Design an enzyme around this catalytic site. Structure first.
Site, PDB file in Angstrom:
ATOM      1  N   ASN A 150       0.804  -1.232   0.000  1.00 46.40           N
ATOM      2  CA  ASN A 150       0.000   0.000   0.000  1.00 46.40           C
ATOM      3  C   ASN A 150       0.839   1.285   0.000  1.00 46.40           C
ATOM      4  O   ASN A 150       0.554   2.225  -0.761  1.00 46.40           O
ATOM      5  CB  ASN A 150      -0.984   0.021   1.181  1.00 46.40           C
ATOM      6  N   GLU A 248       3.835  -4.954  12.411  1.00 43.13           N
ATOM      7  CA  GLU A 248       2.788  -3.941  12.305  1.00 43.13           C
ATOM      8  C   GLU A 248       1.697  -4.547  11.439  1.00 43.13           C
ATOM      9  O   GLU A 248       1.928  -4.840  10.262  1.00 43.13           O
ATOM     10  CB  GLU A 248       3.318  -2.635  11.707  1.00 43.13           C
ATOM     11  N   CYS A 282      -3.088   1.385   6.969  1.00 43.33           N
ATOM     12  CA  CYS A 282      -3.261   0.664   8.228  1.00 43.33           C
ATOM     13  C   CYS A 282      -3.865   1.550   9.313  1.00 43.33           C
ATOM     14  O   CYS A 282      -4.605   1.065  10.183  1.00 43.33           O
ATOM     15  CB  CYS A 282      -1.925   0.097   8.705  1.00 43.33           C
TER      16      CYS A 282
END
Ligand SMILES: NC(=O)c1ccc[n+]([C@@H]2O[C@H](COP(=O)([O-])OP(=O)(O)OC[C@H]3O[C@@H](n4cnc5c(N)ncnc54)[C@H](OP(=O)(O)O)[C@@H]3O)[C@@H](O)[C@H]2O)c1
Ligand SMILES: NC(=O)c1ccc[n+]([C@@H]2O[C@H](COP(=O)([O-])OP(=O)(O)OC[C@H]3O[C@@H](n4cnc5c(N)ncnc54)[C@H](OP(=O)(O)O)[C@@H]3O)[C@@H](O)[C@H]2O)c1
Lengths: 485, 484, 484, 483
Positions: A150, A248, A282
């Site tokens: 992303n 993460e 995120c």
């Protein structure tokens, strides 16, 4: 004029098998490039190269590593347009998105260079007489870096630059949907002239190349950004050799809007926070929670601005708001989210259409906690708005998630802002700003299902170094055994 | 003597009533009846800790510190009880258990001292009109799983520091030292900590421990034990993404160069290699001596080993060595001795065993394929290796899967520093024993010796997380929709 | 054309007064330079004061950007700076090359650190209270510098002070004004906002004293003679401005009997006589163990004899240049004459021609010799022979100064004991006394001054801590007590 | 009452003494020493001789002494409370607060002694170890005021001892007995001879000797700005460092969105606790015009409720007397000036003996003495402003810069004001005189230099010491002829 290739021990080369695959654009399905489809032997070669380069790299003074990073920064500044072009055509990012990513990446490389010389240990008081007691910092060793699609440039470079700065060597495996970005990173490193083996790029399938990196005994640490399920898999496999991990794993961040806000500003902020990069962030504001007293007006303003969003080929001009999702699977999944929400009685306020890899913002109200868009991370532009009657309920809804990455509250009341900030279960929180605020040197990371550890500046250094207690004793003493003496 | 769990402020039986009899390693006499808890008992403890968490985390640190100072007061009145139990249950000598109790006092004091002083950071923001700070928050419910060799100090280092920063605790002691665990629970009870903040569950590792490691309300596990167990815990912990601190033992090198006081070096070596029968994670397990002093060193070392008095540790304060903890340890030490003899080692002294007692067995003529060079020898079997120079000393020192501690004896500043830097360990000591330890220093290893550090603020680091919080004081325009 | 730099403008002093700057090499004219007065100082100070809020309030990253700009401009000016350091300051090629290389590192260091100077988030002892500590710049900072290392000392102070958001009024030493002007050229080319940095070239007791007494100056950082520093500290008290003072030293270099004596002599020659000994951390008192004293003295004198004294403009291999002016020669002559008159044995040197002084080495001195009692900022050096480590330390500490110090030995115990016992702000084992890095705390104790400079220590000097709290609950107050 | 020098209680060498009376009723309290330079010199030499042994023991040993001092203090609480009241004029509630905070202060110093760390640095050179140690400065002079004599003294003394300095302590002349009780506690705690010393005598004699002596390494001082400037100047002769806390004229800013009644209650406590004799007293009250009328009404109402009485009588006395007659005279000057300049006296101004009823003024401007000077007593101006900009301008229109507070529920206004006010400390929605044992306490501008509290006290009385070890030999650039 150049083939895409692995970069291993200072050399660009084909995978050992010679296998390749075709990377296409999410924009229009056109061919971008053939890229390697590496296997375990390629991963092993990169790992061995990183391992053999380690001692020389770790043992030079920090200032020499900083110099290499400053050279990388200079090379990066020359390559900015190349990175923007690829982030758009390969990743589907808009001009504004990829511009932001490239600017931030410049700050990330600079930040790692700036800090390399300044990572300190401690001198301690000894409880014993005639004892010097200190703590050194030492690099962990070979670090595997595994990244998503992303924000493939900034997320990769945050990990790579900081890991390298404190004396680790790197084996990097980019996301399969963004290989050219990873190859451009290797072009940059090569041009900056880092010693061979210190940085290695291997382009190939996660379950093959990634798994080899995660289970190899000469890898000391893995830093990983991606899905929670992948993260749990990696954490489990990493245990085989007791390597440490940084994970993460995404979020379902709450954006809490109280009744004392500027409602039009609140809506503008919410639209940006919830839908930038098609919500494929995120720390996207994925669950919007608004106080009943301003809810009607907020919803109307929010939909109003959503209506204005321009979806298009991100190559067309600099003012496109949204590009496509990364592939057809994402479109299929967003369709499931929308269809689930509607089936459960949710009110689709706006949006819902898709074509090729493009998916419009789809906004819902009248949802409850059993909706998939309340229970799962929605990595795409489908967004619920939840109306609550007070701050207690805002917090209960905000915390009703397995995730815990970031979060935000909009209010002008200092007491309500701080109480809510304290009560929301997240690794990061922002009062009167977007949920995805990020600076190069701050501890970025989450709690609960959102992962473990922190990255950014010295926090990245904390992840990929260890403390080493060393003492010097300046007097002799008597020992308790043998007591007969 | 009957021992119980301590769950949500109440001493109680396991829900099944199942118990087992514990015996002394010294003479096999019955010591106590202790729980054989199951998964339901573990879950009850975890739920209690979870329910106690928010109230405990949210009081000011000074209040938690007050509870720890009270715990310190209670500990000081229980000193003699702890020493007695560490001897009869754990087989420790008076001097050993005295040392452990003194250090335990310091550990509790250290955790109390530090609770108010664990700081976050105020940062420079790269943006205008933005306040950017980092808070410290407790992780939540922390599982504490501990070994049998130094069951009091190791447990209390974990327990006291973990509580200090606002975590709650589910504690499962080693199966060979449950009574030390129960006495810890007694101390905590008398200190009057809020119910649920500390819980004791006594039961099998593969049942109670596994529940702690896999339960979704446990945030973190700190574990001290064998490397294989730690690897299993780390793998199981992944299912809920909980973090871990693992200290998994060592095979620490003690390097002795040719410019030392050889007699002093031998005295130091005997203490470092054989205190508590070598049952210390940071025991000097592989002794490496420079050729030029090797003959004299070996003669002195064996001379002092010969002087060690092995006996019932209850007899008097001057016993040097007690028994090993159980018969499995004796059986393992015999395997180590058998292997060394079979590979051509010269047994200079020792090897005699009776009951759980074992006379320190010292080998020379060993090479890298000996089990006592390749594995952690958690007992009184020790190799002495002779090396020709500092390069070889380092090569042998690092030729291990482990990496906990290490030491060098020399008066030369350059040789000392170069060897310290080259040896691959989490800790290193120049001119002292391998097992130096203070209450507030980062204790832990690298390689197979584990992950994380414990002691003072390093314990705090393990059981807290950073939390970045900002306040933005200006409004701005956003890039989408661009039509605005 | 040399001039002041005030509020973004190069200009003449208000009176138009000037003086001629001559080379210490041959008295040749280098340039006319300003002889500014108090009004020039006040204009600079007001310009700095008006620039302050805008400079302190931008994000740190913007100030870092300006310093990286400065670094780029400096790299272009390297040859210019070296040329002026040599002809104006008397430095050899090797000395000025070193100073320019270190200056590059200093500017970079300040730029690197700007964004990373952190405050603290504290535990509150009260409920519902957030408690943090911010860092704030002090304000306008006066920077007053010496002639010996005028570029590197100036830039260490200037770059780090600007980095954390202070503005600067800079007055270079009267013997090195062109260096100060070149710094202003660099700053101007880097495009820093007007008033953020100001240069005033003029007499210390006029321009310097205005800076030190002005109400809108918040801090003075000063390097120079201890007497001057003491006057400045006194004058600064009037407005309660803070000071950083680095006031020179009489550093001991202690040589023990276990060294490589040839190496020790080579080190000592470099440490005691580089830049003609005009270094605050020069090895000004050489202290050698009796067992190696004769061979050391022979080797040391041997290498001293090899030193090439010449016009430093001549080539890159000149070892020693002239002293900065004839007043320095006259003083070194007094030092030599006092030593000779007191019975000291002059081993070599002591001649002088023009501003060039030939290194004068003495043995058989005692504590009443001026070269033992005072800082000898020139190439006159005593060697003292001692019988043991206790004596070495007594002689090392028998001084009013306390800047740096070093010990040469291969023994780790003797090295550490001596390092601990020597009363100095800095100390180096097995290296020269004048070691200096960009980010370490540089400074002294006793008569050598107060405070530290270098990286974050420079930041500590020119910022202050600011405790801020937020209280999130209402409470009852104890007065009026009648009230409910 | 006697000096405490090198482990021994003793009268001054001259035998000279003076009688101290209660500010409450003028009754006799004690005979106390009037020491001279020789007494100060003896204290200093004792502290100098004790320094190496005290500095060189492990920090844990010094912590143990402080923990023992803590136990002694806990047994002496009632004694300290009585003397703070009868010698100091403090009310029961004030002296209770001081004693409680002092307990925490001593404990804080003990807690931190083992944990003051230096740094291990990256070296820019190969084969170099580079570290920074913390070392005690040496003999430290401790010179203190009369308003919170116990807590201020003990914050300085306990933290300074903890990191291995020795102490020469000179209490304010109006609170010598509190100083002697501190010496009593330290004696019972069994600290080594010379580590802590007490000299009771006149500032211009004993204090000046401390400030100018060559064996004193550092002076930490709390008192008046003029005295502070004096000390800073004298200290320069021997290049000793100083810590100075020199009072304040703190602004309390009250915005229009507050609970006005709560604000008034808070303001009264902040502005008039201990009769306003607090360095961080809310000395200048600044209120937004939209709530000013109601605020002034509520504030005067609560002021009128204050009970002024003999602080010895019971536990509910709100205000006691000022410390002496000179303080009363100065307060009259402040009142006289405000009346002459057109101020409206809403309440108070009455005085009898050392007692004084809080005098509250409105209609003031920036030329009033009570707006230009520190008013260390119960005379308070209330100023009305039209907006936040104006609130900030008034708040900063002072030579001082110690603490400050703003009352508001708006996060933007609170933070902008906090950032804009020029002070060393600042509190949102609380009193101006918030203080914790471990936080950096101190001011900017005329309010002084340095910070005290926990590790900040340690920074003041230690220095950094850079030590290196170089592990390889190298070639040097002179003589250049050498190969
Ligand atoms: C006995 O056991 C000794 C082991 O030495 P040690 O105590 O130093 O190290 P260890 O065997 O690794 O065990 C240390 C701690 O871990 C527990 N444990 C064992 N398996 C576990 C699991 N699957 N999950 C969670 N916890 C588990 C142990 O409980 P248990 O003691 O109940 O196994 C003990 O509390 C041997 O020496 C032998 O003599
Ligand atoms: C009385 O004195 C009060 C002063 O208030 P304050 O105590 O807060 O502040 P202060 O006058 O500045 O006095 C603070 C401390 O400094 C001492 N001192 C005065 N002059 C000194 C000097 N030249 N050198 C060293 N120390 C000196 C004082 O001792 P002394 O008390 O002996 O003056 C006192 O211990 C007035 O309010 C009035 O009531």
């Amino acid at each position: 004029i150049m083939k895409v290739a692995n970069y291993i021990n200072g050399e660009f080369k084909e995978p050992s098998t010679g296998a390749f695959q075709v990377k296409t654009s999410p924009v229009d399905g056109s061919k971008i490039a053939e890229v390697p489809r590496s296997g375990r032997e390629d991963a092993r070669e990169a790992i061995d190269s990183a391992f053999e380069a380690l001692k020389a790299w770790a043992n030079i003074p920090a200032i020499r590593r900083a110099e290499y990073l400053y050279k990388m920064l200079e090379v990066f500044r020359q390559m900015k347009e190349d990175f923007m072009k690829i982030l758009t055509v390969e990743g589907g990012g808009t001009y504004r998105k990829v511009w932001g990513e490239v600017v931030f990446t410049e700050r990330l490389i600079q930040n790692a260079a700036e800090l390399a010389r300044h990572y300190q240990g401690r001198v301690l008081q000894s409880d014993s007489e005639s004892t010097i007691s200190v703590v050194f910092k030492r690099s962990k060793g070979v670090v595997g870096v595994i990244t998503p699609w992303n924000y493939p440039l900034s997320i990769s470079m945050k990990k790579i630059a900081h890991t390298l700065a404190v004396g680790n060597t790197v084996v990097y495996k980019p996301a399969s949907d963004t290989p050219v970005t990873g190859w451009l990173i290797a072009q940059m490193v090569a041009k900056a002239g880092l010693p061979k083996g210190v940085f290695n790029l291997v382009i190939g399938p996660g379950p093959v190349v990634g798994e080899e990196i995660v289970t190899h005994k000469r890898v000391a640490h893995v830093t990983f950004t991606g899905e929670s399920s992948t993260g749990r898999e990696i954490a489990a496999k990493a245990a085989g050799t007791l390597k440490t991990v940084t994970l993460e794993l995404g979020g379902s961040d709450p954006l809490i809007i109280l009744d004392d806000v500027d409602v039009d500003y609140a809506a503008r902020l919410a639209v940006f926070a919830s839908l930038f990069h098609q919500g494929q962030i995120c720390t996207s504001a994925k669950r919007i929670i608004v106080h009943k007293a301003v809810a009607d007006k907020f919803i109307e303003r929010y939909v109003h601005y959503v209506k204005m969003l321009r979806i298009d080929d991100p190559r067309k001009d600099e003012k496109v708001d949204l590009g496509p999702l990364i592939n057809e699977r994402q479109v299929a999944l967003m369709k499931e989210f929308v269809d689930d929400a509607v089936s459960r009685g949710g009110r689709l306020l706006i949006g819902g259409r898709s074509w090729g890899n493009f998916f419009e913002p789809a906004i819902f109200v009248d949802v409850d906690r059993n909706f998939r868009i309340m229970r799962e991370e929605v990595f795409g532009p489908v967004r619920p708005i939840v109306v609550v009657e007070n701050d207690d309920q805002a917090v209960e809804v905000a915390n009703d998630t397995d995730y815990g990455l970031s979060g935000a509250v909009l209010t002008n009341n200092v007491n309500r802002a701080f109480r809510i900030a304290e009560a929301v279960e997240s690794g990061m929180f922002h009062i009167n700003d977007v949920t995805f605020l990020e600076e190069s040197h701050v501890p970025f990371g989450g709690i609960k299902a959102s992962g473990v550890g922190r990255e950014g500046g010295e926090w990245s250094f904390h992840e990929t170094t260890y403390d080493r207690w060393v003492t010097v004793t300046l007097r002799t003493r008597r020992f308790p055994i043998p007591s007969a003496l």
